[PDB]
Ligand binder design. Structure first.
Ligand SMILES: CC(C)(COP(=O)(O)OP(=O)(O)OC[C@H]1O[C@@H](n2cnc3c(N)ncnc32)[C@H](O)[C@@H]1OP(=O)(O)O)[C@@H](O)C(=O)NCCC(=O)NCCS
Length: 147
């Protein structure tokens, strides 16, 4: 499934309702939280970015990004990763994550994330599963580089 991955510079330039609706149906708040909190966590500052995957017809099929992990130094947190159900299993999440990781490791020496649902996906990308309160997966830059 052909997509383009694009940096979000203007949240108001996309129709987010499909992503909001499907994610909410599934019990996920992550798209809602992202869009509601977008004035404070804009993903526009240095060390942060939000991406969308656009279909060949300009429709949003996924989102995901990164920003600074609070309290840690040199650690970034991967945030708000979600692919529309009908768009899953076509390589979109992998393309999105590869872009995020390659860019985020320019700023951070470690990337972390919290995912209860997608361990196989994240392990396939090289993340290590960890038992923390705030994080489920971690990846050091040196491990990323060595791959
Ligand atoms: C996890 C997620 C981001 C992966 O993105 P994706 O575009 O579907 O994944 P890709 O097609 O790039 O596949 C990469 C890996 O992701 C995983 N994956 C594939 N389809 C998936 C799906 N429908 N749901 C969860 N994970 C999936 C597989 O481990 C896959 O490895 P493989 O290609 O070697 O078999 C995406 O499916 C998603 O947002 N799922 C949300 C719902 C969820 O968490 N699923 C749990 C069960 S309800």
């Amino acid at each position: 499934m052909d997509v383009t991955i694009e940096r979000v510079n203007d949240f108001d330039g996309y129709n987010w309702l499909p992503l909001l609706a499907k994610s909410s149906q599934e019990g996920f708040q992550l798209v809602e939280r992202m869009l509601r909190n977008r004035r404070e966590e804009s993903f526009q500052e240095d060390g942060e970015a939000m991406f969308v995957a656009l279909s060949t017809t300009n429709q949003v099929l996924a989102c995901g990004g990164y920003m600074k992990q609070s309290g840690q130094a040199r650690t970034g947190r991967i945030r708000h990763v979600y692919v529309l159900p009908e768009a899953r299993s076509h390589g979109i999440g992998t393309a999105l994550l590869e872009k995020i990781m390659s860019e985020a490791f320019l700023t951070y020496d470690r990337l972390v994330l919290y995912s209860e649902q997608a361990d196989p996906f994240y392990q396939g990308l090289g993340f290590q599963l960890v038992s923390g309160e705030k994080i489920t997966h971690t990846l050091d830059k040196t491990a990323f580089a060595d791959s």
